[PDB]
Design a protein around this ligand. Structure first.
Ligand SMILES: Nc1ncnc2c1ncn2[C@@H]1O[C@H](COP(=O)(O)OP(=O)(O)OP(=O)(O)O)[C@@H](O)[C@H]1O
Ligand SMILES: Nc1ncnc2c1ncn2[C@@H]1O[C@H](COP(=O)(O)OP(=O)(O)O)[C@@H](O)[C@H]1O
Ligand SMILES: Nc1ncnc2c1ncn2[C@@H]1O[C@H](COP(=O)(O)OP(=O)(O)O)[C@@H](O)[C@H]1O
Lengths: 149, 292, 902, 50, 417, 149
């Protein structure tokens, strides 16, 4: 699954990119053809032929909170398998939401508090008081056009 | 350790003739690399505990090699600075009148250095430069005197450059030629192209004592309304400042006259081609375009 | 007055455009920004101060016109890009900032900055940066800028080395930071002058100065410089204004037709290093067209008649500048583009019939071929005329072309013809760089003496300048017959350009008189800074300019004359027989064309095989004359001579064209000759013609008849023992005898251990008056080795009529057997010093002494070398300019039969 | 960058005081020596979007 | 189009300019006028000196001029003024009334926390493509944070098979040199054949060295190092390429270009002077696309007696493949409109990106030297999805509903790939 | 090599090279070995390693020496006079007559040919072997290559 996630979706093929659903475009169809080679699905065209609600899911504003079970394999009762399958599916359809879905795959793998610290602005009064040795200089890099002094 | 003894009795100073009937030392690689190799070798030999065959044979020569180094590292510097200062002081025949105290100081230094040169050339040998009593101390004295006179020359050059700052654009030898070779004006004109923009010459008088105007590289000329007089303004930088000031004022007056003439063309329904051509031929190009 | 009129036209066109376009758009208020945005001048003739009379305003910034005398500087066409550049630069200046235009090179950033500085009357200095930058001078030049009140500038600041870039950036940051303080609201009045730290001192900064940095910038200056994008100038408007200033009517149409034309010549034509289609070239073309139009007007008026075809003048000016630079295959492309943009106008050309007659008379006595139109030699004569045209324009023309093209003979014939016509003597000094160290080319100062010892170039230039014999009665032509690279050409820059002066490290200036041309005879042009190739025009020679038919005609003409009386008679009787084979068809040229598709080591050149063929034909002529001298009664009969020469020609063509390939290619060429020839051939089932010799009386005697099976003495079975005869040995014996009789250089290329050295030495036993000097070439080998060899074996330096180098022994010829002649290391400029040295002293028959700067001539020296196949590791290919003279021999490993016999 | 290298190589000398901290305002560019970057703690400040 | 730098220095310069010009015009210390403000001075100075200084291409200057003209008019002093014409179509952003900085600051602090690219005038779906690019970049980083003879050999053989064999570099003639299209296509085919031969030889050497049959040289060593890292070799890029491209994408694009050149060579062999015009070439598969435009112009000028510079381009987006192909019409395919759609020949703003244009027809009409109506727009034709190289500019009519400034500030363009 | 050289009656010579060796030091060592070989009729086994190689000048001198005996340009004028003195002393030691400079030089070259053997020791084959062959082919022609596995 990870191998397909990183580079396995960048393979090349001959044909099979026929459009089936008017809402499903040619690039999405060709991504489906790539994803079909993974035995974790073993069929994707048949699944999208039925369940016309999928088309509506293809136009949702946040189509990663809810995702239909297009994979038709043994039940991924463990949340990690469901999350990774859904992440691969999100890479297939609507890659823009991928990052958001990425967060979910982190959260369900590390709790819904892992990246919440970065969202809150930092307070150095604790970092420099204890975590910084007096011999270690604290560098404060700033993006050009901004000052952190 | 013997080979050192046989070889050190064979080096001369490898002298060359000079333009002003002198002698100079050119061999420095053989008189530095070989000597430092020898001193390293004798140090390695003597610091070795087995000196039963040279119990007192290396301390007798390590001091000699140290004296060779101490004399020659200053001798080379003295030679280079003296030849450079001789080239400076025997160029334009006016530095004898500009800073005469430096001229006489360098005369005395050159006299002493030529006495030393004759002394070494009479008996050329790498040991016959050690028997001269006070050769070392006189050498540092000559080095200090040459350094002081070179520093004084640099300070004088900076002082001259501070007035009429256009001298900052020219080099050092060019500036020396400018300040020195000033009695006659036939070599200053090759540096005017780097002190001004387009001023490639100066219109001298018949006896090159009064500056009447400026000439361009192609041949355009502007004639000063009040000529600059060198016969009444010596000290070249001063009359150069006068020339540039007269250039500014003459350009201003010519521009005023030209624009006054052009005001006729500006408000004329017709125009005579001959009059326009005469006006074009009268004034300079930049003045003409500015008038338009 | 012409330049003044041009400046007035350039200014008034912009004035009219501004007045009618940007002022007539319903504008009536003098304070409107549509008027306040232009460059306004206000003159007050009552202000006493000189620097307070003329006030120049751009948008809201007031500048006092510094009354610097700029002379006559060329103005710039005020394009809208130039207008916005002026506005941005003045806005930066008013905010006490610096202007930093950027963009691709060639859009006129430096020129725009300089023009703006001149418009306000400010002495501006441009620093080229790049390589000629003077890092030492900046310390005082910046102080001069600060105190004098000058303008200053920079050119391609990013092209500066990082450490000098950082130092200059710090200095300019300090200067600009000090300049920023003049606009302080609290410090509006300057009670204390602003001071800056440049040379560890307080330097007063005049408010009127500036700094401009034109790039193609460091973080220090990012908050101090107003950037500006100048990516493309308005070429159409510039061309239209320049053509209008030249008097051309319908100038807009001509500009609209010519700007796209130059936008095509860099897209359709094959890219070349010397191809320049920038705005500078366009301006040069326009001024040349104006001069041509005025010349036409003067010629017509000498029988205001302003009805000339201006498109014809424009295309003539374009052609007269672009045709010589073409590569002889883009000429149809150039004319197709011209017919595309100019629909129905043809390029007419001058004739110069007097020069045509002079060239014909000179070529008739030099055994060359002359042609006026499409006949043989027409292109070569056209190239010579183009060279003459470039001679009168520039002084640093550099003829370029692949080896074998007739460029050396071109300028030799031109010099002779000009001497005959103009009546002034012609002298040419063929100086060859990269064979002499650059230190001994320009000269050197010994630091312990300050003595100036001039090098070869400085010596000959000083001899020209000093009127010892003649400085203006002759025409000195310093020709640099050798490939170029930016190591010595950098010192020649100040001579090629308009300065026409050479500076010396000892502080001396040498101005060459207006009768000296600095010509280059190169073949690659691939290692040269654009500054060198841009400071001087050039004419491009090509391989097809010199056809093979002219080579054959020259060979036959030099055979019917120049005795190798009875010798010349036998040469003529043989030339008559060989004439039907040099008819641009038939035998020789068909085989020459067919031999260019065969696998040849040391890739073939048309002038190498032909030279070998001519040498061996000369050997045949002297052989048949030797036979005639052998029998006093019954001299050599013409009938037998015919059939002797007819077969010796085939023997020579086989051993010259296929003399550097394996037996397969030799057999293939033999079969091709069998298929195309008409002369009698040996009657053998499968034995190749390579295994036969054209014996005297005209028979194909098999080489096997000269293989004496001998038994060597028992005690000597070693290498010093003479060779045991075999086919290859006894064949290479005759071949090397043929090539050594005429004192021709030789190269034996073959795998190691094949027997090249042994075969050469065995051949050298037959010759009884040839001494051998064996040199072992290797990496890091330089022409000094040959100099030491000459000092060891050629002590004579007598001067009867010039320095002549001769061997110590009388009546003997030395052969310098340079083993592994292609082994010497090739430097990073694609050349070998020793190869160029041994090429100059073979082609020109001498060289230059580095000590006394004199032309020493060879007397009895000859060159033979050994090699390995160039594909062998550690071996590098030889230059074509050197390979052209040396015929190479491929000595392969002896076959099983040869090994058994040996 | 050279003076920054000098500072970082000086910092290897022990500074006995415990309350002494050295804050270095920094620009995100590769010209900074890697030695200081590895030696000291790093913080990155960005302008919030919108 | 470029990642410019619009740091604080430009804002300081703009503030200084505003201060200077407002003080110069408004000598009166109190309210001066809604109309006497030197709007033209401010607009020109921002557009040409301080903000437009860093702008290289013409279209970014056009966008900056559009923004400055929309924002810096006297209408901004009116009580009602839309800073953003349409956020969600019906949602507008009103100009906050006030004469002192406190109310403006209060307005800024009371801005809704929701923010969409429509506030910037961009299409509302720009966030989508931005997020897609960010996700692809994240995948690339993770891949970069993740013997090999066997791994490289299989993919090298796959690339060798995928790339077509050597093309027929045989376009030779004697009476078709006068045809500019033949010249351009001949040089294109020659360059393609040379590059294909070099790539094929290098790939075969890589295949054989991955099998351990020959000792790698320095050039082969660095080529293999480039290949294993997934970075396109430097020695292969002889034509314009998007900045950053994996070797797989480059290999596929090169295979497509070689296929197109093979078809062109076959058509030339069939004809030679009459079929080169009738061919339907895609501008993305050519090493020098603008050279094709120049050659087409040359051929059109050669057919008649007109000069090359008297012709103007005209674009017809013919539906499907009409195959009209007039004497001056030329067929180019693969062009994609960005953020706009064309019905017959008129543009219309769209919320869906990358609309495909089938069989664009380029005609060279002898221009009448007249000013076109103020109802057309000039669209750039870039080469890559990264708009960093201009080929030419088309002139397209628009539906009467929209205005050209919306097209300018929305960022519509034509892409060849 | 040392064992067989001693057992053959050959004085082993070696170069103790440090990082401060230059071309001139190697020229002096070659002058010493040639004086020991030509003059005094002493056979020498000049053995050196690839580690005893630092500059291409070493291999250039080896190329000039291994082939055709004498090294051209190795001796300057003073060195020429000195070598002539030692070689004439050796010639009168053997008994040959003193006629001219040339025949003393040729006797010296013949003695060097007969009484000198150069041994190189190198690490197994790499691109270094190709480079060494390129800079000097003598060690592939004059020197017999004996692999020592
Ligand atoms: N009409 C002709 N004009 C010029 N050369 C001719 C003509 N006919 C025959 N030749 C021969 O062509 C050759 C011209 O060689 P040239 O010296 O001009 O070439 P180059 O390119 O300057 O030389 P190199 O290859 O050594 O650099 C000569 O061998 C000359 O005899
Ligand atoms: N506005 C203009 N008017 C006239 N000539 C121009 C103009 N702009 C550029 N040029 C010409 O372009 C040539 C090259 O400009 P150059 O100084 O090399 O610019 P850069 O140094 O930025 O490449 C100059 O010789 C100049 O004559
Ligand atoms: N009669 C002969 N014919 C051909 N080859 C021979 C003959 N006699 C000896 N040889 C071989 O030719 C070789 C020539 O050696 P050498 O001249 O050093 O080779 P090269 O100069 O070709 O590199 C000898 O090693 C010897 O084995």
């Amino acid at each position: 699954e990870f191998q397909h996630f990183l580079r396995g979706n960048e393979i090349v093929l001959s044909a099979g990119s026929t459009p089936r659903i008017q809402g499903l475009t040619v690039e999405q169809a060709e991504a489906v053809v790539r994803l079909s080679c993974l035995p974790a699905f073993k069929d994707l065209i048949a699944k999208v032929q039925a369940d016309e609600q999928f088309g509506i899911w293809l136009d949702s504003s946040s189509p990663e909170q809810t995702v239909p079970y297009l994979w038709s394999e043994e039940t991924p009762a463990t949340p990690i398998g469901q999350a990774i399958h859904r992440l691969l599916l999100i890479q297939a359809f609507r890659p823009d939401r991928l990052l958001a879905m990425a967060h979910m795959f982190v959260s369900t793998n590390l709790g819904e508090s892992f990246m919440s610290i970065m969202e809150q602005p930092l307070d150095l009064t604790h970092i420099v008081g204890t975590e910084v040795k007096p011999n270690t200089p604290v560098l404060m890099c700033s993006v050009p056009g901004y000052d952190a002094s | 350790l013997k080979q050192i003894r046989e070889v050190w009795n064979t080096y001369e100073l490898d002298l060359v003739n000079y333009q002003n009937k002198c002698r100079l030392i050119r061999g420095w690689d053989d008189l530095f690399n070989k000597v430092k190799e020898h001193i390293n070798s004798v140090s390695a030999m003597k610091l070795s505990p087995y000196y039963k065959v040279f119990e007192e044979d290396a301390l007798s020569w390590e001091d000699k090699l140290n004296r060779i180094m101490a004399l020659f590292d200053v001798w080379i510097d003295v030679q280079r600075r003296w030849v450079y200062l001789e080239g400076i002081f025997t160029g334009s025949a006016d530095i004898k009148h500009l800073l005469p105290v430096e001229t006489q100081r360098f005369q005395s230094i050159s006299t002493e250095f030529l006495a030393l040169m004759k002394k070494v050339s009479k008996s050329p040998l790498v040991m016959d430069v050690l028997n001269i009593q006070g050769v070392q101390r006189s050498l540092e004295r000559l080095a200090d005197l040459l350094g002081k006179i070179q520093k004084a020359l640099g300070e004088y050059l900076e002082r001259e450059r501070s007035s009429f700052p256009r001298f900052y654009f020219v080099g050092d030898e060019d500036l020396l030629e400018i300040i020195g070779n000033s009695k006659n004006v036939a070599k200053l004109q090759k540096h005017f192209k780097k002190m001004f923009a387009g001023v490639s010459s100066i219109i001298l008088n018949e006896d090159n004592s009064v500056v009447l105007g400026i000439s361009s590289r192609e041949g355009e000329e502007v004639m000063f309304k009040t000529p600059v007089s060198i016969t009444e303004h010596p000290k070249i930088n001063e009359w150069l400042t006068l020339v540039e000031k007269e250039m500014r004022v003459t350009l201003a007056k010519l521009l005023a006259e030209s624009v006054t003439e052009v005001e006729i063309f500006g408000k004329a329904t017709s125009i005579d081609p001959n009059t326009y051509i005469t006006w074009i031929d009268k004034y300079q190009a930049q003045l003409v375009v500015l008038s338009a | 007055r012409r330049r003044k009129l041009e400046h007035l036209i350039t200014e008034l066109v912009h004035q009219r455009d501004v007045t009618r376009s940007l002022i007539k758009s319903k504008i009536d208020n003098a304070k409107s920004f549509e008027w306040l945005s232009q460059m306004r001048f206000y003159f007050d003739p009552k202000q006493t101060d000189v620097l307070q009379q003329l006030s120049i305003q751009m948008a809201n910034a007031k500048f006092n016109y510094g009354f610097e005398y700029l002379g006559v500087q060329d103005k710039l066409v005020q394009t809208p890009l130039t207008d916005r550049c002026y506005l941005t630069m003045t806005q930066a200046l008013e905010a006490r900032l610096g202007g930093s235009p950027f963009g691709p090179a060639g859009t006129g950033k430096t020129e725009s900055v300089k023009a703006l500085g001149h418009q306000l009357g400010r002495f501006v200095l441009v620093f080229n940066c790049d390589e000629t930058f003077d890092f030492q001078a900046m310390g005082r030049i910046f102080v001069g800028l600060c105190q004098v009140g000058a303008w200053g500038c920079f050119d391609e600041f990013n092209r500066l080395e990082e450490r000098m870039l950082s130092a200059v950036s710090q200095q300019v940051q300090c200067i600009q930071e000090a300049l920023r303080e003049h606009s302080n609201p609290n410090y509006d009045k300057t009670s204390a002058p602003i001071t800056c730290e440049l040379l560890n001192k307080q330097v007063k900064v005049s408010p009127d100065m500036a700094i401009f940095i034109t790039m193609n910038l460091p973080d220090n200056l990012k908050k101090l410089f107003r950037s500006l994008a100048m990516t493309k100038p308005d070429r159409q408007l510039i061309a239209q204004v320049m053509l209008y200033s030249q008097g051309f009517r319908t100038a807009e149409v001509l500009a609209n037709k010519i700007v796209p034309f130059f936008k095509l010549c860099d897209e359709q034509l094959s890219s070349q290093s010397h191809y320049d289609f920038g705005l500078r070239a366009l301006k040069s073309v326009l001024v040349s067209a104006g001069n041509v139009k005025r010349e036409r007007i003067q010629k017509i008026k000498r029988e205001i008649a302003e009805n000339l075809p201006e498109q014809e003048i424009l295309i003539q000016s374009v052609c007269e500048t672009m045709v010589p630079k073409l590569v002889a295959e883009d000429i149809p492309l150039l004319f197709s583009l011209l017919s595309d943009v100019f629909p129905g106008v043809q390029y007419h050309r001058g004739e110069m019939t007097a020069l045509r007659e002079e060239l014909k008379k000179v070529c008739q006595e030099m055994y060359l071929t002359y042609g006026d139109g499409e006949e043989v030699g027409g292109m070569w004569v056209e190239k010579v005329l183009q060279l003459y045209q470039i001679t009168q324009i520039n002084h640093g023309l550099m003829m370029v072309g692949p080896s074998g093209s007739g460029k050396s003979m071109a300028w030799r014939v031109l010099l002779k013809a000009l001497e005959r016509l103009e009546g002034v003597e012609g002298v040419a000094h063929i100086i060859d760089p990269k064979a002499i160290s650059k230190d001994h080319l320009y000269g050197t100062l010994d630091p312990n003496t300050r003595e100036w010892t001039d090098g070869l170039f400085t010596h000959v230039l000083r001899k020209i300048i000093d009127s010892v014999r003649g400085e203006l009665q002759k025409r000195q032509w310093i020709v640099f017959d050798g490939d170029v690279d930016p190591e010595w050409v950098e010192n020649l820059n100040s001579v090629l350009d308009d300065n026409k002066l050479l500076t010396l490290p000892n502080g001396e200036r040498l101005s060459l008189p207006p009768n000296v041309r600095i010509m280059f005879e190169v073949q690659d042009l691939k290692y040269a800074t654009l500054a060198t190739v841009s400071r001087c025009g050039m004419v491009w020679f090509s391989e097809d300019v010199l056809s093979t038919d002219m080579i054959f005609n020259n060979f036959l003409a030099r055979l019917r004359s120049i005795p190798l009386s009875p010798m010349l008679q036998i040469q003529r009787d043989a030339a008559t027989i060989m004439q039907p084979y040099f008819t641009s068809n038939g035998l020789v040229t068909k085989a020459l064309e067919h031999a260019f598709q065969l696998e040849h080591i040391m890739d073939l050149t048309r002038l190498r095989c032909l030279g070998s063929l001519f040498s061996m034909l000369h050997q045949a002529c002297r052989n048949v004359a030797q036979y005639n001298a052998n029998h006093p009664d019954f001299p050599m009969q013409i009938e037998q001579l015919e059939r002797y020469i007819q077969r010796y020609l085939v023997y020579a063509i086989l051993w010259s064209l296929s003399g550097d390939s394996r037996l397969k290619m030799r057999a293939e060429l033999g079969e091709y000759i069998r298929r195309i020839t008409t002369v009698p051939l040996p009657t053998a089932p499968n034995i190749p013609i390579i295994d036969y010799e054209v014996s005297i009386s005209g028979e194909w005697s098999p080489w096997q008849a000269k293989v004496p099976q001998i038994e060597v003495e028992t005690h000597k079975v070693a290498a010093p023992d003479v060779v045991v005869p075999t086919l290859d040995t006894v064949r290479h014996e005759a071949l090397l005898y043929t090539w050594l009789a005429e004192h021709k250089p030789l190269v034996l290329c073959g795998p190691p251990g094949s027997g090249k050295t042994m075969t050469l030495f065995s051949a050298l036993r037959a010759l009884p008056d040839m001494e051998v000097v064996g040199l072992n070439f290797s990496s890091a080998t330089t022409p000094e080795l040959l100099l030491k060899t000459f000092d060891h074996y050629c002590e004579y330096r007598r001067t009867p009529n010039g320095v002549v180098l001769a061997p110590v022994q009388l009546g003997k010829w030395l052969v310098l057997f340079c083993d592994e002649i292609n082994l010497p290391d090739m430097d990073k400029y694609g050349t070998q010093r020793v190869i160029s040295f041994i090429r100059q002293m073979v082609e020109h028959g001498g060289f230059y002494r580095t000590s006394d700067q004199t032309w020493v001539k060879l007397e009895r020296i000859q060159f033979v070398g050994a090699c390995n196949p160039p594909t062998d590791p550690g071996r590098k290919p030889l230059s074509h300019r050197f390979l052209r003279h040396v015929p190479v021999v491929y000595v392969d490993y002896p076959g099983p039969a040869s090994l058994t016999q040996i | 960058p050279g003076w920054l290298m000098q500072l970082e190589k000086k910092l290897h000398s022990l500074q006995p005081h415990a309350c002494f901290r050295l804050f270095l305002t920094m620009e995100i560019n590769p010209k900074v020596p890697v030695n200081l970057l590895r030696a000291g703690r790093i913080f990155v400040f960005e302008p919030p979007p919108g | 189009s470029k990642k410019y730098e619009f740091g604080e220095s430009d804002l300081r310069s703009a503030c200084d300019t505003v201060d200077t010009w407002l003080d110069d015009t408004a000598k009166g210390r109190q309210n001066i006028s809604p109309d006497k403000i030197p709007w033209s001075a401010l607009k020109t100075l921002m557009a040409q000196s301080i903000y437009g200084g860093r702008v290289d291409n013409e279209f970014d200057q056009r966008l900056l001029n559009t923004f400055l003209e929309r924002l810096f008019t006297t209408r901004s002093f009116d009580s009602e003024f839309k800073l953003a014409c349409k956020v969600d179509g019906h949602k507008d952003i009103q100009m906050p009334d006030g004469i002192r900085r406190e109310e403006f600051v209060q307005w800024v602090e009371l801005l809704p926390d929701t923010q969409t690219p429509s506030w910037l005038g961009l299409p509302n779906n720009a966030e989508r493509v931005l997020l897609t690019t960010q996700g692809v970049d994240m995948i690339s980083k993770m891949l970069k944070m993740q013997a090999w003879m066997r791994t490289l050999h299989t993919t090298a053989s796959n690339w060798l098979h995928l790339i077509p064999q050597t093309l027929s570099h045989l376009k030779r003639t004697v009476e078709n040199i006068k045809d500019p299209l033949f010249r351009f296509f001949e040089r294109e085919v020659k360059m393609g054949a040379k590059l294909l031969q070099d790539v094929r030889q290098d790939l075969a050497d890589v295949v054989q060295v991955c099998e351990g049959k020959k000792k790698q040289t320095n050039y082969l060593r660095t080529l293999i190092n480039e290949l294993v890292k997934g970075i396109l070799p430097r020695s292969w890029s002889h034509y314009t390429v998007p900045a950053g491209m994996t070797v797989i994408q480059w290999v596929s694009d090169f295979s497509e270009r070689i296929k197109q050149l093979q078809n062109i060579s076959l058509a030339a062999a069939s004809g030679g002077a009459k079929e080169l015009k009738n061919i339907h070439v895609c501008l993305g598969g050519l090493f020098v696309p603008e050279a094709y435009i120049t050659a087409t112009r040359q051929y059109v000028a050669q057919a008649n007696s007109w000069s090359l510079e008297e012709l103007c381009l005209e674009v017809n987006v013919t539906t499907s493949q009409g195959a009209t192909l007039d004497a001056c019409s030329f067929g180019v395919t693969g062009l994609k409109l960005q953020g706009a759609t064309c019905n017959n020949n008129k543009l219309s703003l769209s919320n869906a990106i990358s609309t495909a244009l089938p069989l664009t027809q380029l005609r060279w009409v002898k221009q009448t030297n007249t000013e076109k109506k103020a109802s057309v727009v000039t669209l750039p034709v870039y080469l890559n999805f990264t708009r960093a190289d201009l080929i030419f500019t088309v002139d397209f009519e628009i539906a009467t509903k929209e205005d050209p400034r919306s097209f300018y500030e929305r960022g519509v363009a034509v892409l060849c790939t | 090599s040392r064992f067989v050289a001693w057992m053959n009656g050959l004085s082993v010579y070696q170069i103790k090279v440090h990082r401060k060796y230059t071309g001139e030091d190697f020229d002096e060592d070659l002058r010493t070995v040639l004086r020991r070989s030509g003059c005094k009729n002493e056979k020498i086994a000049f053995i050196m390693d690839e580690s005893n190689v630092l500059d291409s000048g070493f291999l250039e001198r080896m190329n000039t020496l291994l082939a055709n005996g004498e090294v051209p340009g190795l001796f300057e004028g003073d060195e020429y006079a000195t070598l002539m003195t030692q070689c004439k002393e050796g010639a009168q030691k053997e008994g040959l007559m003193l006629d001219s400079h040339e025949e003393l030089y040729k006797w010296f070259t013949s003695q060097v040919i007969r009484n000198l053997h150069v041994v190189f020791t190198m690490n197994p084959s790499s691109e270094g072997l190709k480079d060494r062959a390129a800079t000097s082919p003598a060690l592939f022609n004059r020197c017999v290559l004996n692999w020592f596995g």
